[PDB]
Ligand binder design. Structure first.
Ligand SMILES: [Zn+2]
Ligand SMILES: [Zn+2]
Lengths: 689, 579
DNA sequence: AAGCGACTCTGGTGGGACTCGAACCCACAACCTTT
């Protein structure tokens, strides 16, 4: 099942921080690194035959300026630092001088501007369709980053700045009379004012429903700030609130959002893990969305205080087949063990089962990830050992079964610093480093992200055909397995071709036409991008047949919206008469329902033409062709594929795969097409940007 | 500032940090040591099986008599006799200078003082390991697991009335089937109790609690009985080199409760107990570059299991990959136990925040560090080095700020050879260091709150304690049959006229101009140094090396009225509390 | 006078970068080289 994909992504700088590899819902991979976040984007390239993973590389640069936490007035903080450095007591003086939280940049101290942690949002958070990146530097600067154009990541906000202002304006007291205002000349209060705003780790909720999303930021003292962001997020304007709750957990270590669904009742809470062992779920009471609701009472998952640190927590929803209901599996890496707990609401109330699956590794777990679709957990340690860890249902709760993954058989002697499954568990990405050469240390240390398969092409094909999401972008990792096979063997395997025809014959939903279009385009690449020329010309014709189909079905949707909404001159943002003539133009298209739709429209349409003009000419564009429009006197404009207006703008929204184009929405556009412009393109799901 | 000459002949500004360190150490121990810990782990005599003479013989180190040697003492007449002493035997203390040599049967590779609560006035002991064969040398990349012996040597109470005519006594040893021992660390405080403690016959009053780092890659924890309790419990007719086979309190090793897959970690190369009450954690540095911690009181079935013999096995609560290479030395911060420094054979010194192990507080790259010392009062660390990468003559001993104060590294002592071992006396604020050249020196640090670049000249702050010289008279036998060791000892009574006295000129001619010695064993080499951690005997120092001789010295010139008064204060308090 | 703490001041070497010296490689014209 496991073989390597041939790309290895070489990294320029040392990998840095906690759980340093993440693979987003958006199939971008981020490596937190001492001088950047390396961001690797999986493209299912349909325009080239190169069998590799086509990885586009971009990065978030480290900050240029160190993040001094605001603990007092700019003079009083300097007076306090001077006091503690001068303190004749060995304990106070060295406690101050060694804790880099108080000395984020110094004389001989090295800067800590590299990244501690990174956490992708869900998809849909950006101003585009994409997900945002939360990025935490080791000097405690917490930022939210976006890649609005493809080239340059941009900081949308700094949350460490804002929270420091919030605290300063409340004298660092969260409850208005909870204590006297402490003397900042007390090192206990000085340390406290630092501790209460030093972020440990951070995680995004799901989308909440104007959409919203929550970011919980966990501080060294066990405070959690729950930020609420308005969507689409664009900056400080989008921060809808910040509310801080007190966990009371001593030495928090890790954080995750529990989210649950049974009997059509939504519930949610935060699961928090201590550095000393225990794991507990907190009611996030302070919130203002109506759709979500909070845990009734705290529930303790592990109480033991055994001092194994909870290095990681993941949660996956599972349909339990014997209890015949929705349940939630929590797994946590604690030392060299995976704590697991299965939470299952029943008529008996919340039923809780927990255990440790044991004997996994002879060293602490360095990273963990779960296949969200099945709960298969992968765990890793500096041995270069990865272990697949399968949940098997039991009449109540689970048992875990596990087996080692023989990474040494594919990479040789290696250290593994992190792992991440792709969103569909098609690939395991893995940070690797040169290992012990028969007990010799490696003379030189270079980091690489490397990739191994976890599923065969035939399992990927089966999962793509019986797809739940029916969405090529969400499944673009499984798609890359199908791409790799077809490029390698230069034909579509018979069972897939027959099964896809059966799905098209029976269901026929535009997902299966988009899937057929993908196979044909990769096939056309595979045969060198004479009978071979006839074969190329043949399948180029077949691509056009399905590509025209996906167009005509989308044209019918556009006309559908135009018909259902108010027929008013705001229609000028759509070339309605052009589409009417085009869509009925040929008896090559059978659909009587489209022709009657055009009948109703053409009966209601005005006789006034309102033609589209080429701006450089103010001469009409006849709507001759799908891809593009041309005027007399020689100009060419790309047409949009969402609306069909021509892109005469100096800026327009090109698909991630460049298969397709769309306009930016204008304020002149009505809401019902400002909606439509946010669609994925008809030829592939992808962000059109 | 302060001015004039101290009564020992050093300038007052050179002595002023030394006197300051006495009070700082006493206050620290009052706050953060304790008088009792680990009450569960009292020695049980039925776990101390005495091996017979024919059972013990495989464990005994193999040299039966020392090399021939002679000791010259500055300002005394030349004795001229060659001494030689049997394995497990000692020369008598010099009647005026109280130095003692004793022979352990093999080259010494671990050594520590038994800690005693200040004011107890107890009998003082050292634990040490001397390798079986002079010619053995062990590859780091491979586990060993051979047979060896841990030795406990009693030094007496070391009071001025007791020192003339003193001798070291081999009180007992433990047969160890776990290979050679690379580090020894006693529990810093709370392990000792009075030898007269009433305990029923199975239970023996505890002398101490001791961690062994094995080349077998595991740490062994022994609670030690007072010798008188064993000898009264032992039959009187037994052979006097009492070699016991002892079940541990616990075996400490890297693993998980069902992972049989053997650890990458390899040999265990360094130890550090947590410096502060209740000392509940023990750290170890490993060949694979990990630092490992065990939570010794742990009840958890994920960390504690009881073996069929009733001893515990402990699996670690935390590990992290500190270095790209063997972690050759650890020091744990006394002033705040969240911080630890470790140095590796990738020759980086890394300072750690144990709350945040993913990134060191500071890495400073240096020469190939052999040992660290982290004295209580100073933010930085003192580094002994292997010379293989330093520029010629720029190797030596360096003090290195942890980095907030931002001072440049202070070159406290130039050395030609690699300094194998170093220790800082918290009571004195001084370091002593031992060289492949077989020279032992001490150096007094300036008050490292103040920028060392204004130190006019470091040489006035250091002096030699002894140098061993081979005199003709490569295998060990090929050396000893042809050479004897000339130990040259300084007059430590005072530092008057220091730089004009012969041993300083000999040392300064050693610095720079002298040359490395190869194509012989280096029988001259010193391998360990330890200043006394105890307030009683705080001025005493022990060292040893490839000769298998071990030498005890008293730096009379730094023992001074403030410490003598502080001893007597603590003596009176202890006698008032425990009776 | 006698001394402290900056501030240069006189010399020695290492880190990474880079010149160094060599053989190896092209393709052609010269002609030795063969029945
Ligand atoms: Zn035109
Ligand atoms: Zn597209």
């Amino acid at each position: 099942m496991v073989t390597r994909r041939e790309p290895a992504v070489k990294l320029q700088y040392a990998v840095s921080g906690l759980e340093p590899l993440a693979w987003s819902e958006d199939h971008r991979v981020s490596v937190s690194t001492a001088r950047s976040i390396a961001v690797l984007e999986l493209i299912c390239d349909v325009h080239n035959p190169g069998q590799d993973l086509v990885i586009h590389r971009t990065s978030v640069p480290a900050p240029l300026n160190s993040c001094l936490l605001k603990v007092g007035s700019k003079t009083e903080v300097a007076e306090c630092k001077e006091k503690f450095a001068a303190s004749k007591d060995p304990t106070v003086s060295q406690t101050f001088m060694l804790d880099r939280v108080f000395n984020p940049e110094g004389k001989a101290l090295p800067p800590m501007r590299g990244f501690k942690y990174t956490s992708w949002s869900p998809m849909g958070c950006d101003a585009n369709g994409r997900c945002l990146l939360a990025a935490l530097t080791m000097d405690n600067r917490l930022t939210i980053q976006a890649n609005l154009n493809r080239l340059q990541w941009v900081q949308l906000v700094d949350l460490t700045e804002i929270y420091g202002e919030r605290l300063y304006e409340t004298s660092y007291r969260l409850s208005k009379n909870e204590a006297p205002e402490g003397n900042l000349g007390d090192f206990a209060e000085f340390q406290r004012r630092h501790s209460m705003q030093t972020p440990v780790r951070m995680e995004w909720s799901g989308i909440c429903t104007v959409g919203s999303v929550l970011l919980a930021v966990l501080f060294e003292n066990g405070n959690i700030a729950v930020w609420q962001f308005q969507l689409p997020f664009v900056g400080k304007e989008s921060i809808s609130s910040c509310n801080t709750i007190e966990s009371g957990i001593t030495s928090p270590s890790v954080l995750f959002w529990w989210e649950y669904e049974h009997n059509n009742r939504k519930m949610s809470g935060l699961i928090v893990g201590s550095a000393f062992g225990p794991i507990k779920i907190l009611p996030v009471n302070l919130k203002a969305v109506k759709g979500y609701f909070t845990l009734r009472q705290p529930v303790i998952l592990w109480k033991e205080m055994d001092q194994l640190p909870v290095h990681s927590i993941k949660c996956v929803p599972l349909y339990h087949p014997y209890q015949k209901c929705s349940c939630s599996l929590v797994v946590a890496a604690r030392g060299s063990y995976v704590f697991w707990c299965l939470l299952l609401i029943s008529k008996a109330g919340l039923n809780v089962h927990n255990s440790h699956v044991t004997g996994l590794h002879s060293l602490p777990i360095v990273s963990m990830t779960a296949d969200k679709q099945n709960g298969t957990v992968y765990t890793c340690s500096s041995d270069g050992k990865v272990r697949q860890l399968i949940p098997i249902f039991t009449d109540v709760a689970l048992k875990f079964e596990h087996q080692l993954i023989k990474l040494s058989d594919v990479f040789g002697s290696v250290r593994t610093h992190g792992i991440a499954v792709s969103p569909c568990g098609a690939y395991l990405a893995i940070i690797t480093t040169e290992g012990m050469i028969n007990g010799l240390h490696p003379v030189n240390k270079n980091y690489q992200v490397q990739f191994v398969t976890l599923k065969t092409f035939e399992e990927a094909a089966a999962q793509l055909l019986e797809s739940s999401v029916q969405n090529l972008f969400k499944q673009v990792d499984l798609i890359d397995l199908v791409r790799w096979k077809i490029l390698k063997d230069k034909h579509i395997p018979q069972f897939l071709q027959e099964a896809l025809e059966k799905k098209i014959e029976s269901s026929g939903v535009t997902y299966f036409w988009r899937f057929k279009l993908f196979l044909l385009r990769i096939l056309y690449q595979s045969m060198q991008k004479e009978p071979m020329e006839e074969k190329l010309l043949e399948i180029q014709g077949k691509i056009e047949a399905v590509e025209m189909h996906l167009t005509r079905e989308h044209m019918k949707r556009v006309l559908g919206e135009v018909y259902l909404h108010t027929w008013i001159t705001e229609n000028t943002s759509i070339p309605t008469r052009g589409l009417c003539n085009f869509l009925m133009s040929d008896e090559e298209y059978d659909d009587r329902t489209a022709r009657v739709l055009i009948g109703h429209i053409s009966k209601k349409m005005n006789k006034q033409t309102f033609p589209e003009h080429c701006s450089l000419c103010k001469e009409i564009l006849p709507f001759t062709d799908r891809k593009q429009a041309v005027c007399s006197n020689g100009h060419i404009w790309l047409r949009c594929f969402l609306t069909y207006q021509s892109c005469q703008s100096l800026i327009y929204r090109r698909c991630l795969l460049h298969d397709s184009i769309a306009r930016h929405p204008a304020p002149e556009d009505p809401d019902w097409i400002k909606r439509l412009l946010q669609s994925p393109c008809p030829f592939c799901d992808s962000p059109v940007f | 500032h302060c001015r004039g000459m101290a009564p020992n002949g050093l300038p007052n500004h050179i002595m002023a940090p030394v006197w300051k360190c006495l009070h700082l150490t006493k206050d620290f121990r009052e706050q953060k040591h304790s008088y009792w810990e680990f009450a569960e782990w009292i020695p049980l005599a039925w776990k101390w099986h005495l091996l017979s003479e024919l059972e013990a013989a495989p464990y005994l180190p193999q040299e039966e008599k020392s090399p021939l040697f002679s000791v010259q003492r500055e300002g005394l007449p030349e004795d001229g006799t060659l001494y030689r002493i049997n394995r497990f035997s000692s020369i008598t203390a010099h009647p005026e200078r109280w130095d003692v040599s004793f022979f352990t049967g093999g080259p010494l590779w671990a050594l520590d003082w038994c800690p005693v609560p200040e004011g107890a006035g107890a009998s003082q002991y050292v634990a040490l390991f001397s390798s079986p064969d002079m010619n053995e040398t062990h590859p780091l990349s491979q586990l060993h697991s051979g047979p060896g012996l841990l030795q406990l040597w009693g030094l007496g109470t070391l009071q001025q009335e007791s020192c003339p005519g003193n001798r070291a006594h081999f009180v007992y040893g433990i047969a160890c089937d776990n290979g050679c021992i690379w580090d020894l660390k006693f529990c810093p405080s709370g392990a000792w109790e009075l030898p007269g403690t009433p305990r029923k016959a199975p239970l023996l009053p505890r002398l101490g609690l001791l961690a062994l780092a094995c080349s077998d890659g595991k740490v062994l924890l022994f609670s030690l009985p007072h010798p008188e309790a064993l000898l009264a419990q032992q039959p009187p007719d037994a052979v006097k080199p009492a070699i016991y086979k002892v079940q541990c309190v616990a075996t400490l090793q890297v693993g998980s409760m069902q992972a049989t897959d053997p650890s990458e970690c390899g040999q265990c190369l360094s130890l550090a107990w947590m410096p502060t009450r209740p000392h509940q954690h023990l750290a170890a540095g490993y060949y694979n570059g990990m630092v490992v911690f065990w939570n010794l009181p742990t009840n958890s079935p994920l960390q504690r299991i009881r073996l069929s013999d009733g001893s515990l096995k402990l699996y670690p609560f935390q590990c992290f990959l500190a270095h790209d290479q063997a972690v050759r030395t650890l020091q744990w911060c006394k002033a705040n136990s969240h911080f630890l420094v470790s140095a590796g054979s990738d020759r980086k010194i890394k300072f750690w925040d144990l709350r945040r192990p993913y990134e060191p507080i500071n890495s400073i790259k240096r020469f190939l560090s052999t040992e660290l010392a982290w004295l209580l009062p100073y933010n930085g660390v003192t580094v002994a080095q292997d010379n293989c990468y330093a520029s010629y003559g720029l190797c030596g001993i360096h003090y290195i700020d942890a980095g907030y104060l931002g001072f440049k590294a202070y070159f406290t002592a130039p050395r030609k050879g690699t300094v194998w071992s170093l220790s800082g006396s918290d009571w004195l604020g001084t370091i002593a260091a031992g060289d492949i050249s077989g020279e032992l020196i001490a150096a007094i640090l300036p008050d490292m709150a103040l920028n060392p670049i204004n130190v006019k000249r470091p040489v006035e702050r250091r002096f030699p304690i002894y140098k061993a010289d081979l005199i003709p008279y490569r295998t060990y036998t090929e050396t000893v049959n042809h050479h004897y060791l000339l130990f040259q000892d300084t007059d430590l009574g005072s530092f008057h006229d220091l730089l004009r006295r012969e041993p300083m000129l000999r040392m300064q001619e050693g610095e720079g101009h002298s040359q490395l010695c190869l194509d012989r064993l280096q029988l001259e080499a010193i391998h360990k140094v330890r200043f006394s951690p105890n307030l009683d005997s705080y001025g005493w120092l022990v060292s040893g090396g490839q000769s298998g001789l071990v030498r005890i010295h008293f730096v009379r010139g730094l023992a001074s009225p403030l410490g003598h008064r502080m001893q007597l204060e603590s003596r009176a308090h202890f006698n008032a509390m425990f009776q």
